[PDB]
Design a protein around this ligand. Sequence first.
Ligand SMILES: [Ca+2]
Length: 224
Amino acid sequence: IVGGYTCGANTVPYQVSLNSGYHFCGGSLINSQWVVSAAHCYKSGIQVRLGEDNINVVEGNEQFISASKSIVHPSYNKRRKNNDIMLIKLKSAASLNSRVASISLPTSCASAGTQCLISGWGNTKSSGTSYPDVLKCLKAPILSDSSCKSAYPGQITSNMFCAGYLEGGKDSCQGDSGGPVVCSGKLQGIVSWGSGCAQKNKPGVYTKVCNYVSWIKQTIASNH
Ligand SMILES: [Ca+2]
C-alpha cells in the first residue's frame, strides 16, 4: 500500500498473509475454513497466516494453517487478468475470535464513489521498494466505469473495477495482491493489477467480487 496508514494490530481481522517462506500475497477469510485471494497468487506450498500484524515477529494471536486446496477460477486468464480469483481451503478450521474474523460477501455490487478499505503488507513506495512489518491500510473510492476504461483502454472487463486516486500517491502495490477491498462491511474487491503503483492517471484495478458469489458458494458446497 502506497500513501496509506498503519491499520493498528488486528483491526482488519479478516486480512490474511499467504506465506511460502516469505510473505507473497494477501487474502480474505470468508468463513473458518476458506480464504479468497487472487488467481495470480496461486502456487503450491501455501501457508495461510491469520491474526497477523507484524509479519516478521511472533506477537501472539497468529494462527498458521496450510492450504489443503487452492482453487483458481477455471476461466482465469493470465495475460488479461480476467477472473483473477482463487479460493483457498484451510487444512483445519481457524479459531474465530475478535482478531481472526470472517468478512461478509456482497449481496449486491457496489457503486462508483463508494469509499472502501484496502489493506496489505505490499510495497509502500511507488518508485523503488520498501516492505512494511505491520499491516497497512488505505481508504479509496470506487471509480466510474467510464473513468476506469479511459484509464485502461482495452484492458477493463466486467469482472474488474478501478478504485483509488487519479492524482497519484495512494494505491495498493506489489505484495498487496489477493488482498481485500471492503466497502460497507462487504468484500467487494480483490487486489488484482495496475500499471506501476500510485502513478497519475493509473488507479488500482480490482477483481469484482459481487460477480463471483454464486461461484464461491457452489465451489465451497461441492468441496466438502
Ligand atoms: Ca506476527
